[PDB]
Coordinates of C-alpha atoms and ligand atoms in Angstrom, one line a residue:
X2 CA 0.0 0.0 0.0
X3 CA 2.9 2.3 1.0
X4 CA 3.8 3.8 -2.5
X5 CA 0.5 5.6 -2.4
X6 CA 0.3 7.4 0.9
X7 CA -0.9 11.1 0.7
X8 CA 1.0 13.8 0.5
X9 CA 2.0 15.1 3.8
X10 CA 4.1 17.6 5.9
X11 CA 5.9 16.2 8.9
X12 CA 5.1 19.3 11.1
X13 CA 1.4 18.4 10.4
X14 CA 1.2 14.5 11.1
X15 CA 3.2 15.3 14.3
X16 CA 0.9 17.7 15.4
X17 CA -2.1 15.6 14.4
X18 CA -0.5 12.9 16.6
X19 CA -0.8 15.4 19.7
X20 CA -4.4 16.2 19.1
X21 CA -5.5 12.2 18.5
X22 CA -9.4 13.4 17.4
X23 CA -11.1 14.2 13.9
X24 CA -15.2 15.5 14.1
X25 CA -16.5 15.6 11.2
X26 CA -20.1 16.4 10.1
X27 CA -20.9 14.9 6.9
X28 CA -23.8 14.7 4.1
X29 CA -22.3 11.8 2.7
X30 CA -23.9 8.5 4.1
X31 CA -21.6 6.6 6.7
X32 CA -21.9 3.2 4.9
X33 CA -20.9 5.2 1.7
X34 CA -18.1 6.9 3.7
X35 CA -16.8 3.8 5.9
X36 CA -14.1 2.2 3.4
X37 CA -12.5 5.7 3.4
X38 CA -12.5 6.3 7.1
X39 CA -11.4 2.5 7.7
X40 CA -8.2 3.5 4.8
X41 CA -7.9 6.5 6.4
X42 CA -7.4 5.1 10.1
X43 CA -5.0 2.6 8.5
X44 CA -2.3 5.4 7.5
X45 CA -3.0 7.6 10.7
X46 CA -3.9 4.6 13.0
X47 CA -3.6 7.7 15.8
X48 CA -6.7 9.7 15.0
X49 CA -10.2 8.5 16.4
X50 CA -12.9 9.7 14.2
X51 CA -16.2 11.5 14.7
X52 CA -18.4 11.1 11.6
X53 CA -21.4 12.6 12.3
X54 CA -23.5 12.0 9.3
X55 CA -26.3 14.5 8.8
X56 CA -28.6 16.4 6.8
X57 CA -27.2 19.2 4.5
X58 CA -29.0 21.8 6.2
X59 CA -28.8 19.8 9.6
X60 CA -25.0 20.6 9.0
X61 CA -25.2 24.5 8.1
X62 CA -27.4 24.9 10.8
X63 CA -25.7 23.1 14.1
X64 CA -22.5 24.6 13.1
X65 CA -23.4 28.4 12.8
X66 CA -24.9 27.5 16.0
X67 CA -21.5 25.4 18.0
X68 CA -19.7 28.9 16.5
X69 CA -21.8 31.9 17.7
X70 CA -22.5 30.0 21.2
X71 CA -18.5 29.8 21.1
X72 CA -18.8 25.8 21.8
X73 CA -16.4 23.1 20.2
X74 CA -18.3 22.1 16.7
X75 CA -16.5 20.1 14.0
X76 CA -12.9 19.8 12.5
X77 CA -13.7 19.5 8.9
X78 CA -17.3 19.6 7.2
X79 CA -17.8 18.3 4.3
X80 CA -21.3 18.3 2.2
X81 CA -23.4 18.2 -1.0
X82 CA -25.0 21.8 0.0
X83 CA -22.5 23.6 -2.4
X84 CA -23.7 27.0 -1.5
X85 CA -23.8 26.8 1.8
X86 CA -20.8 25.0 1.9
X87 CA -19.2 28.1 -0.4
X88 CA -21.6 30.8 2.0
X89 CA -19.5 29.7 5.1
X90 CA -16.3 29.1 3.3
X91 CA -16.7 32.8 2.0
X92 CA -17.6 34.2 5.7
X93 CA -14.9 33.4 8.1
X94 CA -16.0 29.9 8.8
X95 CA -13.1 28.3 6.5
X96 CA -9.2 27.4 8.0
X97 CA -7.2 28.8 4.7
X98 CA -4.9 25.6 4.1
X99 CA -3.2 25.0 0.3
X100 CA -3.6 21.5 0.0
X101 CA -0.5 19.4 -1.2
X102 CA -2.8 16.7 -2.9
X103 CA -4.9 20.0 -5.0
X104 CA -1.7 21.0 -7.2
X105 CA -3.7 20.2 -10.2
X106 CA -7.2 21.1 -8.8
X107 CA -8.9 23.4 -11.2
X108 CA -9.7 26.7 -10.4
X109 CA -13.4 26.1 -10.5
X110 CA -12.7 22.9 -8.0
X111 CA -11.6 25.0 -5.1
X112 CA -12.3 28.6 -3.2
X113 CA -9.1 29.7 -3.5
X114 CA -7.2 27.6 -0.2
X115 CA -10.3 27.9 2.1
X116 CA -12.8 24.6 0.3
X117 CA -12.3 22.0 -2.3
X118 CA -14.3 19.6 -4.4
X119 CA -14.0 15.9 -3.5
X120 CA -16.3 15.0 -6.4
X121 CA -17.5 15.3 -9.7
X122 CA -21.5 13.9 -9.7
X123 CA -23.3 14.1 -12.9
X124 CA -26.8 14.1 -13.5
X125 CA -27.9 11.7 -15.6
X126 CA -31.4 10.0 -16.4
X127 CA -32.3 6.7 -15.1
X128 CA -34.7 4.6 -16.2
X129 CA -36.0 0.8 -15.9
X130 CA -35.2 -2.2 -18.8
X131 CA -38.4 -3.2 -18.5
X132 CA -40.1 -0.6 -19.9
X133 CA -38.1 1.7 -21.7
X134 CA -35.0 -0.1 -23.6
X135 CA -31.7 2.1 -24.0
X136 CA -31.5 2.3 -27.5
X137 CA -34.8 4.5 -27.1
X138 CA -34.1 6.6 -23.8
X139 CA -33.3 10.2 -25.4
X140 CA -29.5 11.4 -24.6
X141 CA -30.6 15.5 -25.0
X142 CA -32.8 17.6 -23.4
X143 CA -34.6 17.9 -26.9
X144 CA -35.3 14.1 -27.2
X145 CA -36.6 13.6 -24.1
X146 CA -39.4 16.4 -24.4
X147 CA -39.9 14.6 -27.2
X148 CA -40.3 11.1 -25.5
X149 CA -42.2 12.8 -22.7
X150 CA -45.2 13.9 -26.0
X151 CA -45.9 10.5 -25.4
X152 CA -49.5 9.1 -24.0
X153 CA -47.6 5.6 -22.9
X154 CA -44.8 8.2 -20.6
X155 CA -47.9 10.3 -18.9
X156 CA -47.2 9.7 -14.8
X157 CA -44.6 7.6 -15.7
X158 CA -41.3 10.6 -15.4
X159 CA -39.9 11.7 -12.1
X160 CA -37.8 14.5 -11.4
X161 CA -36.6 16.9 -8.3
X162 CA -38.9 19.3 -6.5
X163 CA -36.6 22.3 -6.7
X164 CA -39.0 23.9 -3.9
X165 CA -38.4 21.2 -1.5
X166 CA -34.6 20.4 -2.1
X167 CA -31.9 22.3 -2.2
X168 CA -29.5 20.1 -4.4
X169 CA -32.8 19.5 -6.5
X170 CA -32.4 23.4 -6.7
X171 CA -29.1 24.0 -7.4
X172 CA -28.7 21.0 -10.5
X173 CA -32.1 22.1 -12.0
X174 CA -31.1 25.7 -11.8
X175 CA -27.7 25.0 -13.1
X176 CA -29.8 23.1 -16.5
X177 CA -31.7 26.0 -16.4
X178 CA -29.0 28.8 -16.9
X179 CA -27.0 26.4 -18.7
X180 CA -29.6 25.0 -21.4
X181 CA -31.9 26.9 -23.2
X182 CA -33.4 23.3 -24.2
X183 CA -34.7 22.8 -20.7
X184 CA -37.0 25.3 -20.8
X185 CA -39.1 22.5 -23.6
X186 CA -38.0 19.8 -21.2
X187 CA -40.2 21.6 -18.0
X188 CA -42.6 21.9 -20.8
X189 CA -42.7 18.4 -21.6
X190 CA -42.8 17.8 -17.4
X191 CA -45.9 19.4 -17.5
X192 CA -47.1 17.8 -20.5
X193 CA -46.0 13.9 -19.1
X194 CA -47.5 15.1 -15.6
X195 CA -44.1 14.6 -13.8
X196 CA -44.2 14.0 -10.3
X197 CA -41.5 15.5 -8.3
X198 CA -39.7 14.2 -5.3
X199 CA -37.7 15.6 -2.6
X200 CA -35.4 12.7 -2.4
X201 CA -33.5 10.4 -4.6
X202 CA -34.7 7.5 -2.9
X203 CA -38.9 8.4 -3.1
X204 CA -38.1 8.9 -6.9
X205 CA -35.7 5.9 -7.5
X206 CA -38.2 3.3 -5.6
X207 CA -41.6 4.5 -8.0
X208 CA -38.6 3.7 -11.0
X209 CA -37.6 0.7 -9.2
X210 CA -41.4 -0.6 -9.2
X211 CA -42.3 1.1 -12.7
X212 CA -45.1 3.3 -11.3
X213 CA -42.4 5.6 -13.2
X214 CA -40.0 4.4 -16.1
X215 CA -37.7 7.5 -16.3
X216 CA -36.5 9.9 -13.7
X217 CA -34.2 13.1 -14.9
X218 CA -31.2 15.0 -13.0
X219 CA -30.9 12.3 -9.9
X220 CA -27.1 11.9 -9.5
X221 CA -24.6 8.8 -11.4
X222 CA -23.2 8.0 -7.8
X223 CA -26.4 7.2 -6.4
X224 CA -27.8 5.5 -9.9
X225 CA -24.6 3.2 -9.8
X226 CA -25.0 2.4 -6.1
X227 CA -28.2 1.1 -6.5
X228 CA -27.5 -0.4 -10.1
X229 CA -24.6 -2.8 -8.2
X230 CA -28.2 -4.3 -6.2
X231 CA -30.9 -3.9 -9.6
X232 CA -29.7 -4.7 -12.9
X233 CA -33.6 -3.5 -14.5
X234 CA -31.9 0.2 -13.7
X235 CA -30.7 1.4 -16.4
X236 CA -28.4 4.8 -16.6
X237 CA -28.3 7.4 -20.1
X238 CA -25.4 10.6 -19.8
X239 CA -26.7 13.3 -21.5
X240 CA -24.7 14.3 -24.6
X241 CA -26.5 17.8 -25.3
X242 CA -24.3 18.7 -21.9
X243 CA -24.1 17.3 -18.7
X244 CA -24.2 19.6 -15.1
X245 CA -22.4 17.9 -12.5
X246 CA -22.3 18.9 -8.3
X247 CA -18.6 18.8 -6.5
X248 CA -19.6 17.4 -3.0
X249 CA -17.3 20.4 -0.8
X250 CA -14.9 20.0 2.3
X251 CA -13.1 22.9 4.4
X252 CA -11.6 22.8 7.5
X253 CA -13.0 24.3 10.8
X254 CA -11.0 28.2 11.3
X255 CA -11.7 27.1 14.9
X256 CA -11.0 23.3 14.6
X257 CA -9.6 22.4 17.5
X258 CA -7.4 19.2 15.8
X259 CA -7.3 21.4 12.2
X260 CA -4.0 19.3 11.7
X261 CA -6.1 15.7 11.5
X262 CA -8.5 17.7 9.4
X263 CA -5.9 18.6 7.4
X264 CA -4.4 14.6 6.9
X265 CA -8.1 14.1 6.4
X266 CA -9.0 16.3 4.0
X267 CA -5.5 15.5 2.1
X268 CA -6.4 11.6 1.9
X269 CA -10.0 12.5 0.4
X270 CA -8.8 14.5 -2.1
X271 CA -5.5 11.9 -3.1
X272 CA -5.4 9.4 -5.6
X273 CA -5.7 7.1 -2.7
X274 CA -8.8 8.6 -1.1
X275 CA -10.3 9.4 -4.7
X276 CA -9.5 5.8 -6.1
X277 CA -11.4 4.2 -2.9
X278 CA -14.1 6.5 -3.2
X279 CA -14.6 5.9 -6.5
X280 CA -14.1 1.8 -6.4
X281 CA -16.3 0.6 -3.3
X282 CA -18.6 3.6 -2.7
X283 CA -19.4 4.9 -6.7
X284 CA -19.0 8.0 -5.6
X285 CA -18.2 10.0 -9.0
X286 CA -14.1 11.2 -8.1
X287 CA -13.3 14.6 -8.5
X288 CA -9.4 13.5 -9.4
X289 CA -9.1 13.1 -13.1
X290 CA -6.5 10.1 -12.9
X291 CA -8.8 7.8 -11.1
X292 CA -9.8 4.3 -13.1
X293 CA -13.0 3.3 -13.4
X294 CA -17.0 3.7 -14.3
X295 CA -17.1 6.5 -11.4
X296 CA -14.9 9.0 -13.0
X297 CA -14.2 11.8 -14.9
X298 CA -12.7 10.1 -17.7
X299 CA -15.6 7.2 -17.7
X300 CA -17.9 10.6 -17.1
X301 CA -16.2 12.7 -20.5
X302 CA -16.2 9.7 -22.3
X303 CA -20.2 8.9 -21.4
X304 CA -21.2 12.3 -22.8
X305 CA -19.3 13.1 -26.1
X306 CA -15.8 14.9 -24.0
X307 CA -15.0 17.1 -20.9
X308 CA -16.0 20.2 -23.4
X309 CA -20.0 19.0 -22.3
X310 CA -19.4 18.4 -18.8
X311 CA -20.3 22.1 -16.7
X312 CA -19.2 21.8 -13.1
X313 CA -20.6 23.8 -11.0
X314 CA -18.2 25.8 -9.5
X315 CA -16.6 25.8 -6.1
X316 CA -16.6 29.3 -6.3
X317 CA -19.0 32.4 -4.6
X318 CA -20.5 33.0 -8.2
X319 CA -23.0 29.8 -7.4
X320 CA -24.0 32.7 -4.7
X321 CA -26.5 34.1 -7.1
X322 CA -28.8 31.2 -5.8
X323 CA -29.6 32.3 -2.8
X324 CA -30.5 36.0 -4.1
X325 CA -34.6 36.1 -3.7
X326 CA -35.2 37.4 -7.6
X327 CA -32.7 35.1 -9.0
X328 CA -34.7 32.3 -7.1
X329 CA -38.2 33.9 -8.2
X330 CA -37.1 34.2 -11.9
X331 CA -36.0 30.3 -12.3
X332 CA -39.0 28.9 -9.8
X333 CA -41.7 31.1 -11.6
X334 CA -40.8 29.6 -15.1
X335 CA -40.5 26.2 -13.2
X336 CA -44.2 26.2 -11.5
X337 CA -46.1 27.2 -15.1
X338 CA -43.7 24.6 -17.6
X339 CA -44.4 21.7 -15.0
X340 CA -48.0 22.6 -13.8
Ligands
1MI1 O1 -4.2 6.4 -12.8 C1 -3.9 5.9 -11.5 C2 -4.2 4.4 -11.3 C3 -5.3 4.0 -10.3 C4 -6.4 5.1 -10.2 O2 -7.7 4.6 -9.9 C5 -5.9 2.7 -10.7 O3 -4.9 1.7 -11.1
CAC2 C1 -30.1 14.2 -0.6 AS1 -30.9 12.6 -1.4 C2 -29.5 11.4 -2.1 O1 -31.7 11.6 -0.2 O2 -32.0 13.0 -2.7
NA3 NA1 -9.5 28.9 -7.1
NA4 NA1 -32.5 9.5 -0.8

């Protein structure tokens, strides 16, 4: 294993020693998370972990509280809420660190040194064998309005509630701004009577049983996590362009072991980390070396190159989200195309 230990500075591992402890709070799902924590224990055998695995805004919220009461919160944070994520990093919250293992992080894939992608998620369309066959599951925005004309697809698409989900937000919002073809896909939402869900899982289970047979902008980690257990799901990469999430980590300014959080946050981001990540828990890897159906070369071959990938950026521009026009501009369109 030794050849592939993550890049570290002695100073750092020796303090990290002294302090023995690592809390972190976490939207990724323990049993998703647990090969990397067990790797990670296995080259710092010295640092006895706190994952706390919790809502996205379960996160934002108990932290901004452990910091204004003045109380010991987490050493590291890392979540899918990219704008919250970026909101904190951007407001004092953030421990400014230049990761070794980020050399060749894009600009886009980090706030500067204060937070960092760890992933690269597309979202995709999933749909079951049974009822719709791959060679006819539309790869384009335009195709699938197209599909979704259809009598036979009528209550049979799912898709996010961008009203009662933030991601669901943030990757239909990114479509929107990014594709003037999804404005006819909400259309065609309307037209099929999508039903929207608030959850990956409420949509993938009425895929699962049929009572749908196509669900748009759910994530590729979580399709191929539950493809592994149900070989009827079926995955198509859009090839019109594809918008992908970056899951974000920063370390605690007021961690009180920031040096584990530091040999933590090195390892996720390392080929090491990223290769794990990628292998057991089909997480999509942020790291563009990594080998396999989870990553960004699998991801840029999927959809016709990198040139039709758009990441949304680590980066306070994603800001404009939160602004209560920008929001009323995308969820006015939203509520008339799909009701
Ligand atoms: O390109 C680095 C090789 C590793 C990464 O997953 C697999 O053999
Ligand atoms: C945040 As989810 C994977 O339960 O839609
Ligand atoms: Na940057
Ligand atoms: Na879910």
């Amino acid at each position: 294993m030794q050849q592939s230990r993550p890049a570290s500075d002695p100073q750092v591992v020796e303090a990290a020693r002294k302090e023995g402890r690592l809390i972190i709070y976490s939207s990724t799902d323990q049993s998703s998370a647990q090969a990397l924590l067990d790797d990670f224990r296995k080259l710092y055998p010295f640092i006895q972990i706190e994952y706390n695995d919790l809502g996205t805004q379960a996160i934002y919220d108990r932290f901004v509280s452990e910091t204004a009461a003045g109380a010991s919160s987490a050493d590291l944070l890392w979540s899918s809420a990219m704008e919250l994520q970026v909101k904190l990093a951007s407001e004092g919250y953030a421990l400014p660190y230049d990761s070794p293992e980020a050399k060749n992080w894009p600009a886009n894939a980090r706030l500067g040194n204060l937070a960092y992608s760890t992933t690269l998620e597309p979202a995709v369309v999933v749909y079951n064998k049974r009822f719709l066959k791959p060679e006819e599951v539309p790869t384009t925005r335009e195709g699938l309005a197209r599909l979704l004309q259809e009598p036979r697809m009528r209550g049979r698409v799912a898709t996010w509630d961008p009203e009662r989900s933030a991601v669901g937000f943030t990757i239909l919002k990114a479509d929107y701004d990014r594709f003037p073809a999804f404005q006819e896909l909400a259309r065609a939402f309307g037209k099929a009577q999508a039903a929207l869900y608030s959850s990956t899982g409420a949509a993938f289970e009425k895929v699962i049983s049929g009572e749908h047979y196509l669900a748009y902008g759910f994530f590729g980690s979580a399709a191929l996590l539950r493809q592994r257990t149900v070989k009827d799901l079926g995955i198509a990469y859009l090839t019109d362009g594809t918008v992908a999430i970056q899951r974000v980590a920063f370390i605690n300014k007021r961690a009180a072991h920031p040096n584990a959080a530091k040999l933590f946050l090195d390892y996720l981001l390392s080929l090491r980390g990223q290769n794990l990540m990628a292998y057991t828990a089909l997480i999509f890897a942020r790291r563009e070396t990594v080998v396999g159906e989870a990553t960004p070369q699998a991801l840029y071959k999927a959809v016709g190159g990198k040139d039709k990938v758009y990441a949304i950026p680590v980066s306070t521009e994603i800001l404009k989200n939160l602004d209560p026009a920008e929001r009323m501009r995308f969820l006015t369109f939203w509520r008339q195309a799909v009701r």
